[PDB]
């Protein structure tokens, strides 16, 4: 890693086995999930492409996800190359050096080249660009693996509107859906299957109402096993 | 986070996984509940919008509550835009742009802009502003998922009067009656929701007696459960 | 509107009566439908804000919709003055006097001022800006009034798929639903309610089948697909 | 009508037969619908008193109504001579003569004088004055040809109530009422004739009740979205 | 559209609403016939993408055809993108960018861009290019709503030979066959699929018989040569 970038007095430190092992223990606990992404970002503060490759290659589990994440890196590298201006050929004093797709992912570029770009004025932030591609891959992996079905998170007929809301938002955890689609899913899977007295209020509130209003609603409505409206 | 933020010129220091690990552990142990709010306020000392978003993305669980909190910060951001509208045209060359609600939430803005606003004179303290919106959301979650009501509470059958006063005060901290009302509860409601063998003792003692005297009162009420707790 | 005989625009002249009738008649026969906006765009080329108000005033149908549309214009007019800083002190060198938000909607300034702004070089595009506010208002009305049932389409036993598709897309077009919802309508209705003889081909093309392949399917299959119409 | 040849330079043009067709049809075939006032305003844009008099006597239906229009013109022409000197002495050298009430209505004036006043500096907008007098005549006829009094309006048992509001606002275009009276109608007539779901919105909101709330209510009744309102 | 300029490069002319009214009327009656393509070409003379989009979205009927045009535009635009990679680096001083597939469709291109390409040196005729893509789509649509392919066109039991040949050519015109296929079909298929009693007569005049010779034969085949209307 490189520390004090944008702060003055930059220091290069070697990647620690302790940090790599701590990262693997985090991966063992949390797998590839929404909460692992800021932990990965925090661990990768001032990481070079070589440091990032070392972090990717130290993982033992979830190898199908790692190869698919590597495909996402390959697609981003191919895109990066595709939109890049024309770099000069094998010139006699040695090449000028501007990071191409495989340079960004550390494959064709050295640690000293990566340090060269990161210590430039203005900096060329090769580790940050690569880290964004890894995050884009992590979002892709989180969407690819689904925890629960839309079928089984449907609202209980006598139950209140609480736990099913958690399950619905766990189900759609990294999805990118529009507010109109999200409301239609909320209505179809939850509001439609709600108890009559609660449901009329939720239907009356409709799509452009707050979640807070929908949670606040349904006063004077009974529990699932209770035999009267009062609790 | 920012360092040299009291009587100085601030420097940005990168976020630690150790701080995040502590936050994740506090959320694991204590969920969102009254004692969490000052702990959150304390770790939000010297925090940027990026750091605050880093804390929000490390929560993991609590999906419906987090969605309501996200809407709450969006409502507060919309109020900030309504109060302080920003001009229709692009910014002039040579002029520093004005913070919008999205910029404060860190969804259309980056650290250098944020440092710029915090180094205005008088400054715009964007992390302090955003933290207050998040704290309102957390206080809203605590009210939504409150444990039992302060009116409805009763002294337990195996519960010492002292340990009841603590549980009543914990309940009150969730239920948040005003300071004048807390003083009224201390001399009134606290006595009235006690067990009836202790009610006579409290009336004879005088309901305005000091809290240490109260913590040393009604000893032996609560059968063998009292005797297995006062040792 | 503003016209000139040998190209360009200069002299203001009265709204043409065939054009005025054509505007009233498209609204009368089609109501608040997507095809009104392009016809309105063609008719209102070089119209003043006064002429645009004449168009809004002339239609005697749908007054409740007009009140909502007018209030939409009021939000935009208020917003325009709120996002452009108010000038005080002496008017600028060679400044003819800028349009305000209520001036743009023709409420508070003369036809002579409007002509002055529009015959300016390059033009100050007050009519073009005002019809955006009108189009936004119309789209809010189109949401209220355009939709029809797509569930309640009823076709004969051996009807051509191409003639069901024609009915389905006219119906789908009337719906203002977001694309994922429209895909759900397409999945649950169009390939499921279709004639058996063509339905086998739709299943053979597979559940991701594209429309050109679907419309080239089923040659000489079904009834005529052209009778019992224009009755 | 007058029409601009160059900016500030006007030539007379013959009246369009389209204008005559539209005017007679709105007056006679739509039997004094309140769209006559904006249609008259739109069609009379370049009109002179001679054009307006030609329009007045091309009507063959409703000759009692035409006499009421003529009487309204006679009364307003009398008012002009009440508020402007009837004797101005000998008219000034190189000045147009001051217009009497009869001159405004094209009775003692000629077309050359009418164009002369309207193209003067300061200009006298003689047609625009005469249009107001005609509009006052139209308004009384429109009230007389209004079929039913506003408080006596009724509904069917499965009315969505959107049309009742649409009819109520259209009715106020024919026979007007003050804002305080309309506020009273909003809390009386509308509350009585509304279905429970719409009525709850009216009862809660009072006179300033917002149309979008009631237009996003009453879905179970079977109105728009179940029945087509667009072709 | 853009029209001839006597003093320089061709100038904007606002879109005719008469052309829109004619275009919709043509689509209602003539859209499933090869008649539509020349009529569309005559109507769309000098049209920009904006003019073409205005024509396409004024059509609210025939939505299966409109969706088929849009599907064709997607397919054609993608083929244009395969033909032209997007340039990296800044645009040349005073120059304008190459158009991509979305630009041709009018989606990403301004009226100044559309006119700028069409007045370029050498000009890029983007309106004509978009119009041929629409024509390619219309050519699919006429065949899609044609009753079957030409190989299955056979002479009916009471159908005249001349009427069958007119129908055969109308169906062949919908199919759009290459010239030697049409010649072979005239020589062979037309004779082969004719009525058996007619077909022996067609054979008698040999395979060198002209269309004039062939339709000189076959009198007393099917119903009347000169029809009567039924009431």
Short mmCIF file of C-alpha atoms in Angstrom, two decimals, chain B residues 25-218:
data_model
loop_
_atom_site.label_atom_id
_atom_site.label_comp_id
_atom_site.label_asym_id
_atom_site.label_seq_id
_atom_site.Cartn_x
_atom_site.Cartn_y
_atom_site.Cartn_z
CA UNK B 25 -19.93 -5.55 17.10
CA UNK B 26 -21.99 -2.80 18.87
CA UNK B 27 -24.79 -3.24 16.28
CA UNK B 28 -24.55 -7.06 16.78
CA UNK B 29 -24.75 -6.73 20.58
CA UNK B 30 -27.21 -3.86 21.06
CA UNK B 31 -29.04 -3.45 17.67
CA UNK B 32 -30.54 0.05 17.39
CA UNK B 33 -31.55 0.96 20.96
CA UNK B 34 -31.02 4.10 23.21
CA UNK B 35 -27.38 3.44 24.24
CA UNK B 36 -26.34 3.08 20.56
CA UNK B 37 -27.26 6.74 19.72
CA UNK B 38 -24.51 8.44 21.88
CA UNK B 39 -22.04 5.72 20.78
CA UNK B 40 -22.88 6.56 17.13
CA UNK B 41 -22.57 10.32 17.92
CA UNK B 42 -19.13 9.69 19.52
CA UNK B 43 -17.75 7.73 16.51
CA UNK B 44 -19.25 10.44 14.26
CA UNK B 45 -16.81 12.94 15.82
CA UNK B 46 -14.49 13.98 12.94
CA UNK B 47 -16.53 11.93 10.44
CA UNK B 48 -16.95 12.88 6.74
CA UNK B 49 -20.10 12.05 4.65
CA UNK B 50 -18.02 9.19 3.13
CA UNK B 51 -17.30 7.89 6.67
CA UNK B 52 -21.00 8.21 7.65
CA UNK B 53 -22.03 6.23 4.51
CA UNK B 54 -19.28 3.69 5.43
CA UNK B 55 -20.98 3.24 8.85
CA UNK B 56 -24.46 2.92 7.21
CA UNK B 57 -23.18 0.27 4.74
CA UNK B 58 -21.52 -1.75 7.59
CA UNK B 59 -24.84 -2.19 9.51
CA UNK B 60 -25.68 -5.39 7.55
CA UNK B 61 -29.06 -6.21 9.16
CA UNK B 62 -32.16 -4.18 10.10
CA UNK B 63 -33.49 -3.75 6.55
CA UNK B 64 -36.91 -2.08 7.16
CA UNK B 65 -35.44 0.22 9.84
CA UNK B 66 -32.50 1.14 7.54
CA UNK B 67 -34.93 1.84 4.65
CA UNK B 68 -36.94 4.19 6.94
CA UNK B 69 -33.67 5.88 8.04
CA UNK B 70 -32.64 6.26 4.36
CA UNK B 71 -36.00 7.89 3.60
CA UNK B 72 -35.56 10.13 6.72
CA UNK B 73 -32.15 11.45 5.53
CA UNK B 74 -33.73 11.95 2.05
CA UNK B 75 -36.59 14.00 3.66
CA UNK B 76 -34.06 16.14 5.58
CA UNK B 77 -31.93 16.59 2.41
CA UNK B 78 -35.08 17.76 0.55
CA UNK B 79 -35.77 20.28 3.38
CA UNK B 80 -32.18 21.61 3.00
CA UNK B 81 -32.77 22.08 -0.77
CA UNK B 82 -36.17 23.76 -0.12
CA UNK B 83 -34.66 26.20 2.43
CA UNK B 84 -31.45 26.83 0.42
CA UNK B 85 -32.11 26.53 -3.39
CA UNK B 86 -29.04 26.37 -5.70
CA UNK B 87 -29.09 28.25 -9.05
CA UNK B 88 -30.32 26.92 -12.44
CA UNK B 89 -27.08 27.62 -14.42
CA UNK B 90 -23.72 25.78 -14.11
CA UNK B 91 -21.21 27.34 -11.63
CA UNK B 92 -18.99 30.21 -12.91
CA UNK B 93 -15.23 29.59 -13.49
CA UNK B 94 -13.53 30.99 -10.32
CA UNK B 95 -16.54 30.45 -7.99
CA UNK B 96 -16.90 27.74 -5.30
CA UNK B 97 -20.19 25.78 -5.66
CA UNK B 98 -22.95 25.58 -2.98
CA UNK B 99 -23.70 22.33 -1.01
CA UNK B 100 -27.03 20.70 -2.00
CA UNK B 101 -28.85 17.94 0.01
CA UNK B 102 -27.39 15.16 -2.18
CA UNK B 103 -23.90 16.69 -1.78
CA UNK B 104 -24.25 16.62 2.06
CA UNK B 105 -25.46 12.99 1.91
CA UNK B 106 -22.36 12.29 -0.27
CA UNK B 107 -24.29 10.95 -3.28
CA UNK B 108 -23.23 13.70 -5.75
CA UNK B 109 -20.00 14.82 -4.10
CA UNK B 110 -16.50 13.70 -3.10
CA UNK B 111 -14.03 14.40 -0.25
CA UNK B 112 -12.20 17.41 -1.77
CA UNK B 113 -15.52 19.32 -2.24
CA UNK B 114 -16.56 18.31 1.31
CA UNK B 115 -13.20 19.51 2.78
CA UNK B 116 -13.71 22.75 0.76
CA UNK B 117 -17.10 23.48 2.40
CA UNK B 118 -15.75 22.58 5.86
CA UNK B 119 -12.87 25.06 5.18
CA UNK B 120 -15.26 27.91 4.26
CA UNK B 121 -15.30 30.78 6.80
CA UNK B 122 -17.87 30.55 8.54
CA UNK B 123 -17.83 26.85 7.43
CA UNK B 124 -20.64 24.57 6.29
CA UNK B 125 -20.13 21.56 8.61
CA UNK B 126 -21.51 18.86 6.27
CA UNK B 127 -20.67 15.83 8.50
CA UNK B 128 -22.30 17.53 11.51
CA UNK B 129 -25.40 18.33 9.40
CA UNK B 130 -25.63 14.76 7.96
CA UNK B 131 -24.99 13.12 11.39
CA UNK B 132 -28.03 14.95 12.84
CA UNK B 133 -30.25 13.60 10.01
CA UNK B 134 -28.95 10.04 10.72
CA UNK B 135 -29.49 10.50 14.52
CA UNK B 136 -33.11 11.57 13.83
CA UNK B 137 -33.49 8.33 11.80
CA UNK B 138 -32.01 6.24 14.66
CA UNK B 139 -34.35 7.97 17.18
CA UNK B 140 -37.25 7.20 14.78
CA UNK B 141 -36.20 3.49 14.72
CA UNK B 142 -36.06 3.46 18.57
CA UNK B 143 -39.62 4.86 18.73
CA UNK B 144 -40.91 2.47 16.01
CA UNK B 145 -39.45 -0.67 17.69
CA UNK B 146 -39.86 0.52 21.35
CA UNK B 147 -39.71 -2.37 23.90
CA UNK B 148 -42.83 -1.87 26.08
CA UNK B 149 -44.78 1.30 26.99
CA UNK B 150 -43.95 3.42 30.10
CA UNK B 151 -47.66 3.52 31.11
CA UNK B 152 -48.12 -0.24 30.58
CA UNK B 153 -45.04 -1.44 32.59
CA UNK B 154 -45.42 -3.28 35.93
CA UNK B 155 -42.93 -4.40 38.62
CA UNK B 156 -41.96 -8.10 38.12
CA UNK B 157 -42.99 -10.89 40.56
CA UNK B 158 -39.33 -11.82 41.25
CA UNK B 159 -38.03 -8.25 40.77
CA UNK B 160 -36.48 -6.00 43.53
CA UNK B 161 -37.81 -2.40 43.65
CA UNK B 162 -34.31 -1.00 42.83
CA UNK B 163 -34.00 -3.25 39.75
CA UNK B 164 -37.55 -2.19 38.74
CA UNK B 165 -36.50 1.53 38.91
CA UNK B 166 -33.61 0.74 36.51
CA UNK B 167 -35.95 -1.13 34.09
CA UNK B 168 -38.52 1.73 34.30
CA UNK B 169 -35.71 4.26 33.55
CA UNK B 170 -34.47 2.08 30.61
CA UNK B 171 -38.11 1.98 29.33
CA UNK B 172 -38.42 5.77 29.78
CA UNK B 173 -35.19 6.33 27.80
CA UNK B 174 -36.90 4.58 24.84
CA UNK B 175 -40.34 6.24 25.46
CA UNK B 176 -38.93 9.82 25.91
CA UNK B 177 -41.36 11.81 28.02
CA UNK B 178 -40.15 15.47 28.53
CA UNK B 179 -37.86 16.52 31.49
CA UNK B 180 -40.78 18.04 33.50
CA UNK B 181 -42.67 14.76 32.91
CA UNK B 182 -39.60 12.67 33.96
CA UNK B 183 -39.62 14.62 37.26
CA UNK B 184 -43.40 13.91 37.55
CA UNK B 185 -42.83 10.16 36.80
CA UNK B 186 -40.06 9.95 39.47
CA UNK B 187 -42.50 11.11 42.20
CA UNK B 188 -45.74 9.64 40.71
CA UNK B 189 -45.90 7.02 37.89
CA UNK B 190 -42.92 4.99 39.17
CA UNK B 191 -44.75 4.43 42.51
CA UNK B 192 -48.10 3.69 40.81
CA UNK B 193 -46.78 0.82 38.60
CA UNK B 194 -45.02 -0.90 41.56
CA UNK B 195 -46.38 -4.02 43.36
CA UNK B 196 -49.04 -3.18 46.04
CA UNK B 197 -47.02 -4.40 49.06
CA UNK B 198 -44.35 -1.83 48.02
CA UNK B 199 -46.95 0.94 47.29
CA UNK B 200 -47.81 1.31 51.02
CA UNK B 201 -44.07 1.42 51.92
CA UNK B 202 -43.45 4.16 49.31
CA UNK B 203 -46.44 6.23 50.52
CA UNK B 204 -45.26 5.95 54.17
CA UNK B 205 -41.63 6.73 53.13
CA UNK B 206 -42.73 9.74 51.02
CA UNK B 207 -42.67 9.60 47.17
CA UNK B 208 -40.16 12.50 46.92
CA UNK B 209 -37.39 10.61 48.81
CA UNK B 210 -33.92 10.53 47.13
CA UNK B 211 -32.99 7.88 44.53
CA UNK B 212 -30.37 6.24 46.81
CA UNK B 213 -33.09 5.91 49.52
CA UNK B 214 -35.44 4.43 46.85
CA UNK B 215 -32.69 1.99 45.73
CA UNK B 216 -32.47 0.86 49.42
CA UNK B 217 -36.30 0.59 49.84
CA UNK B 218 -38.90 -2.24 49.82
#
